[PDB]
Design a protein around this ligand. Structure first.
Ligand SMILES: [Mg+2]
Ligand SMILES: [Mg+2]
Ligand SMILES: [Mg+2]
Ligand SMILES: [Mg+2]
Ligand SMILES: [Mg+2]
Ligand SMILES: [Mg+2]
Ligand SMILES: [Mg+2]
Ligand SMILES: [Mg+2]
Ligand SMILES: [Mg+2]
Ligand SMILES: [Mg+2]
Ligand SMILES: [Mg+2]
Ligand SMILES: [Mg+2]
Ligand SMILES: [Mg+2]
Ligand SMILES: [Mg+2]
Ligand SMILES: [Mg+2]
Ligand SMILES: [Mg+2]
Ligand SMILES: [Mg+2]
Ligand SMILES: [Mg+2]
Ligand SMILES: [Mg+2]
Ligand SMILES: [Mg+2]
Ligand SMILES: [Mg+2]
Ligand SMILES: [Mg+2]
Ligand SMILES: [Mg+2]
Ligand SMILES: [Mg+2]
Ligand SMILES: [Mg+2]
Ligand SMILES: [Mg+2]
Ligand SMILES: [Mg+2]
Ligand SMILES: [Mg+2]
Ligand SMILES: [Mg+2]
Ligand SMILES: [Mg+2]
Ligand SMILES: [Mg+2]
Lengths: 187, 159, 176, 49, 104, 50
RNA sequence: ACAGAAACCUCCCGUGGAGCAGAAGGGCAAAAGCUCGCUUGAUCUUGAUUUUCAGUACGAAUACAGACCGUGAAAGCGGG
RNA sequence: GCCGUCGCUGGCAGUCGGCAGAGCGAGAAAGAGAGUGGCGCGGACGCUACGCCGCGACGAGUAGGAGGGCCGCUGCGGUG
RNA sequence: UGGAAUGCGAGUGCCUAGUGGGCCACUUUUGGUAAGCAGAACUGGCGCUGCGGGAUGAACCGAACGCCGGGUUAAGGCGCC
RNA sequence: AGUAGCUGGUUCCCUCCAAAGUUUCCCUCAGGAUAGCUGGCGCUCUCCGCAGUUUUAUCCGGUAAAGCGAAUGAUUAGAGG
RNA sequence: ACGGACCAAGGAGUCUAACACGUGCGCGAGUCGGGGGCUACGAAAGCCGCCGUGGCGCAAUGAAGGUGAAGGCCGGCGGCG
RNA sequence: GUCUACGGCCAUACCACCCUGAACGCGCCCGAUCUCGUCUGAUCUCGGAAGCUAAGCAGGGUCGGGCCUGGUUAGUACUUGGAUGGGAGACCGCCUGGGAAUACCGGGUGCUGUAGGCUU
């Protein structure tokens, strides 16, 4: 026998999307074809992101897409997203943008179309530029979810600004002993 | 069960060598340490202030802070499953400039040199260290006297 | 060591390593008896290490050759100077043998210390083998063959190949 | 390029020694099998490969 | 009711089942711990590093124009060596054609 | 197998009995074939053997 | 001189064989001991760090920093 | 030789057919590219892509975990 | 000239059951006259693990397991069982 | 249907990974909480890094040995004053 | 060491509330009518926006009174120097 | 060559005794009104310069003690890993590697930094 260890033999990546919708399971067919039949590492990333769960592809804001498409050089490019393009009501001017995402909220379709930009789909993108030339891949903030504030070093630990799970927050909800230098100690 | 004393088990580690007691030399205090210096720890027992805990005596680390009478260094400590990076304020008398990085530096500069030269002569020199290779073939001259003949000696109960 | 098969008689020379102090050290010949050169060099280093302040790493083997016999067609009388250990102490011995080869007589000396004294092949230390004239031998088991008109019958010829005729009619004969 | 050739070579899988080992648990100088048998590795290779 | 008191037997193997890993060595290590007065003067140095910018370009572009007058002032056997040249897919294309024509 | 011998028998890629490999000799190699000496039987291969 | 084994004075040798509050260990000789002079750093206040450690507390401790102070010609040392 | 797992994040929409031309295994980053001047009407299979195909390595297991069951029981909405 | 050798894709994040009676062996080792005793250190095992050998066998020697054909071995053996 | 840290049971197949009896705290020692070991889900990249390994430099240490004509402690005998 | 003569049927991680993470879906800085009202299966389904009250999210921090989340260059005027 | 001040590594520098020290210094030395301090100008501090290398101090010496460094001790003691090696064990041998410490026997007995003198 051989003395190997099978602890890590099973790589845990997503072989396919977990959803069962058929307008996504057809996009994943087209992009798995492009991914294997082209030598562009763009299609492979789009496919690998079409697998990802709803918590790994977060929403984009219109303002963050503004400031990520205003960077010098990347003009007249198509902003590709795999999640959704939410609105950002705290932005007043909107330029013209060529965009391709899975969803665009009904109050961001308005702004983008009144501006004069195009809103493509992933099939329109795959027909416009198969190898994905002239594109700008984006992805929303992943640590935006409030969940990532309880993760890290446990609370009650020197210099661990991690949020605890508490029913409510107030004067008399975990503010007495492990927080006051007076009553006991604090970290 | 043993005791958790700060200085339990250092009768030989923190003692001074034979006939090396008394005043501590001054080259210990008139040498300089700058952030990035590879320093090795050796707790001297004469000065008691700022003594490093016994679990660091003999480790190496790098400096990150410097105060009047002491520096702060970052030594690695293997703690029961893992190797934390610990930050200790060791006083100056418990420190030496480790001459380990020294040879690496005197080889780096020698490489930069031998690469600067041998670049105008177009040749190609060896810059890596190679392990001591198997010794090549040689002739052993037996000029005159033939090899002396050895043989085991009988036993002698010299007890 | 393990006295496998028949031992060969090897002549190994070897010297320490050249250094700045000793620009050339003296060579040291030994006369090893072992199954093969791989064990002969290891007994050469065992000996050199037991005599000189010299190890295998700090030195080198200059030559390891087999020395044949100068008269393998003349019955000779070999005398060997043993040095071995028992369960309690260590003793020197001197044993004599009749053989044609020196390595032959040494094989017979290892099998004889094994038979009589139950000494494993690693306790024994041959220290000197020497062809002795027939008039200098001491053991009467070897002096008894120094006769010119030797004559004796084979008195009890025990039947071998007991299984080829395994089932037979006649009974075996032992007189010949 | 010895490092690269030897790492391109999948380590050889040899059969059992035809005839049989002398003694697996003791050094070759101890009348066994282990250790270095400088010249005599080929005698084992012929009966193992 | 005496129970075994302490041991470390399996511990040196549990430690290595998930390895013992040195900490994550990153560049730009933190500045916590450094003495206050020094790190206060380093903050006063950063706060005013911009104050000498328009003078810093006047030297960077200077030595970059000088980079012009810097650089524009200086500006095993014959057999298996010929076979290893005929057998080159690109470099040997014409030594190969010279042979292909050879049999006409 | 000891862990120090199991790490070296797997940097020699000998993860299985009767596995074989070629090894160039130096100080750092002989000093490993000495650690793993009781588990291997190494030698100098002929040209016919290679 | 009285003065004795042992008072007090004097010279010499004296690596510590003494002493440093206590158990032992370590350390200490123009000192960390002994004797004097002045004192209250045994004060106020931020954080960092070590020791046990989960690397949580308490206790103790180490490096600073900001104040106010003591000492000393000063360099310095001192928040038990 | 057969079964299975893992890996290749492998290959296959090219079944491109008288609107035809049947290829991408070969050591060497990239076009069997365009233009610009000197008779007989014929050709297996495939592809529930959640499908099919090819390669290697691997295959113990209590406590425990996970997956896959065209394994099984009873009722409900559809559908045979 | 990516500055020793050899080998090997790594890094990171959540959620988490069971466990928290252990025992044996080589070597070191404390109490005890010692113990198939009590107690530690390093490594390997049994527990959680079959198989060939040791007549028998938790722990010893070899060797770790999908189902099969041929060949060859280890440790042990070859008067008969 | 009182509570039970205690005793006894706890129902179909296959495939894959696979332990612990150890740390600290507890009116804790037949139990918990905690770290560890395990599995699950992943994600970021590769298609530089890392290592239960050696080499070369470089520090560390007071065990094995050895010592008492060397300090401390123990200790036999004469000889010369 | 304990339970077990035999056979049949029954027989043991269930449901509600809370919380956390993971996952699918719709909408998305919003979101939701769950309470109420209007219009056989149907006690269903549909609808209400001047029914979104209210919950959660969009702001934290302090015991509190309370406060509550980039700036830079430019001239021109007064002041120090 | 050498001395003074401040030193570096702190015996190859230390300890005992003896021999020689030109010149500059370094010292001993002469005093106590003033600075300062005591039983005591002994010490310390202060003002000096008649006297002298006597001593310290410098150099050298000793079949010197010590210290430093080598050899022998010794491939010995000890030691990593190994065996279905031996022995009833107590322990011992062997393969693979590393490898000491006395006694005993040799050699050496301060190098050196900055500044300033003498040796014109
Ligand atoms: Mg297998
Ligand atoms: Mg056969
Ligand atoms: Mg004083
Ligand atoms: Mg202060
Ligand atoms: Mg299995
Ligand atoms: Mg227990
Ligand atoms: Mg229990
Ligand atoms: Mg018991
Ligand atoms: Mg026991
Ligand atoms: Mg069991
Ligand atoms: Mg059990
Ligand atoms: Mg196991
Ligand atoms: Mg087993
Ligand atoms: Mg038996
Ligand atoms: Mg009940
Ligand atoms: Mg698993
Ligand atoms: Mg497994
Ligand atoms: Mg209980
Ligand atoms: Mg029980
Ligand atoms: Mg000790
Ligand atoms: Mg001893
Ligand atoms: Mg019972
Ligand atoms: Mg019964
Ligand atoms: Mg039933
Ligand atoms: Mg939870
Ligand atoms: Mg969710
Ligand atoms: Mg609420
Ligand atoms: Mg003269
Ligand atoms: Mg006087
Ligand atoms: Mg004098
Ligand atoms: Mg064995």
């Amino acid at each position: 026998g051989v003395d190997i260890r099978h602890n890590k033999d099973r790589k845990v990546r997503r072989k396919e999307p977990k959803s069962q919708d058929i307008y996504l399971r057809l996009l994943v067919k087209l992009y798995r074809f492009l991914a294997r039949r082209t030598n562009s590492t763009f299609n492979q990333v789009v496919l690998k992101r079409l697998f990802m769960s709803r918590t790994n592809r977060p929403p984009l804001s219109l303002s963050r897409m503004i400031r990520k498409m205003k960077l010098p050089g990347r003009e007249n490019k198509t902003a590709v997203v795999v999640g959704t393009v939410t609105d950002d009501v705290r932005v007043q001017e909107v330029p013209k943008l060529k965009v391709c995402a899975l969803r665009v909220t009904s109050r961001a379709r308005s702004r983008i179309l009144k501006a004069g930009g195009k809103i493509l789909t992933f099939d329109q993108l795959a027909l416009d530029s198969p190898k994905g030339r002239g594109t700008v891949l984006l992805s929303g903030p992943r640590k935006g979810r409030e969940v990532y504030r309880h993760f890290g070093k446990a609370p009650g630990t020197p210099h661990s600004h991690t949020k605890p799970y508490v029913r409510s927050k107030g004067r008399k909800f975990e503010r007495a002993r492990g927080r006051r230098a007076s009553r006991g100690y604090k970290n | 069960t043993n005791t958790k004393g700060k200085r339990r088990g250092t009768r030989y580690m923190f003692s001074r060598p034979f006939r090396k007691h008394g005043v501590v030399p001054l080259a210990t205090y008139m040498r300089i340490y700058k952030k990035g210096d590879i320093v090795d720890i050796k707790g001297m027992g004469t000065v008691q202030k700022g003594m490093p805990h016994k679990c660091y005596h003999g480790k190496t680390g790098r400096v990150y802070n410097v105060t009047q009478h002491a520096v702060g260094i970052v030594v690695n400590k293997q703690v029961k499953g893992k190797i934390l990076a610990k930050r200790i304020n060791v006083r100056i008398e418990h420190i030496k400039h480790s001459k380990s990085r020294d040879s690496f530096l005197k080889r780096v500069k020698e490489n930069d040199q031998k690469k600067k030269e041998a670049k105008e002569k177009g040749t190609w020199v060896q810059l890596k260290r190679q392990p001591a290779p198997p010794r090549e073939a040689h002739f052993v001259r037996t000029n005159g006297k033939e090899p002396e003949l050895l043989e085991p000696i009988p036993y002698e109960f010299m007890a | 060591m393990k006295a496998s098969g028949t031992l060969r008689e090897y002549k190994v020379v070897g010297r320490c390593l050249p250094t700045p102090k000793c620009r050339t050290p003296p060579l040291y010949r030994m006369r090893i008896f072992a199954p093969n050169h791989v064990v002969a060099k290891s007994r050469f280093w065992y000996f050199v290490s037991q005599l000189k302040k010299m190890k295998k790493s700090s030195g080198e083997i200059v030559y390891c050759g087999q020395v044949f016999e100068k008269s393998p067609l003349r019955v000779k009388n070999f005398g060997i100077w043993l040095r071995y250990d028992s369960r309690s102490g260590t003793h020197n011995m001197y044993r004599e043998y009749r053989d044609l080869t020196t390595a032959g007589a040494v094989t017979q000396c290892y099998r004889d210390m094994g038979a009589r004294h139950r000494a494993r092949a690693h306790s024994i230390q041959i220290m000197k083998v020497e062809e002795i004239a027939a008039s200098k031998c001491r053991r009467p088991a070897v002096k008894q063959f120094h006769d010119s008109k030797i004559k004796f019958p084979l008195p009890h010829r025990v039947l071998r190949r007991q299984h080829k005729p395994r089932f037979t009619t006649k009974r075996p004969n032992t007189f010949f | 390029h010895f490092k690269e050739a030897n790492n391109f070579l999948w380590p050889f899988k040899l059969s059992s020694p035809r005839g049989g080992m002398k003694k697996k648990t003791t050094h070759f100088v101890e009348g066994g099998d282990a250790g270095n048998r400088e010249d005599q590795i080929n005698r084992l290779i012929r009966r193992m490969n | 009711a005496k129970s075994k008191n302490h041991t470390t037997h399996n511990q040196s193997r549990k430690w290595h089942r998930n390895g013992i890993k040195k900490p994550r060595s990153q560049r730009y290590e933190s500045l916590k711990g450094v003495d206050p007065k020094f790190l206060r003067n380093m903050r006063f140095a950063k706060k005013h590093n911009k104050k000498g910018l328009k003078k810093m370009q006047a030297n960077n572009a200077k030595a970059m124009a000088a980079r012009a007058e810097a650089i524009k002032a200086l500006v095993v056997s014959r057999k298996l060596h010929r076979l290893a040249y005929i057998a080159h897919p690109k470099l040997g294309r014409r030594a190969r054609a010279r042979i292909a024509r050879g049999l006409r | 197998v000891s862990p120090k011998v199991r790490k070296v028998l797997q940097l020699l890629r000998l993860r299985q009995i009767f596995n074989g490999t070629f090894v160039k000799l130096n100080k750092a190699s002989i000093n490993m074939l000495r650690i793993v000496e009781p588990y291997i039987a190494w030698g100098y291969p002929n040209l016919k053997s290679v």
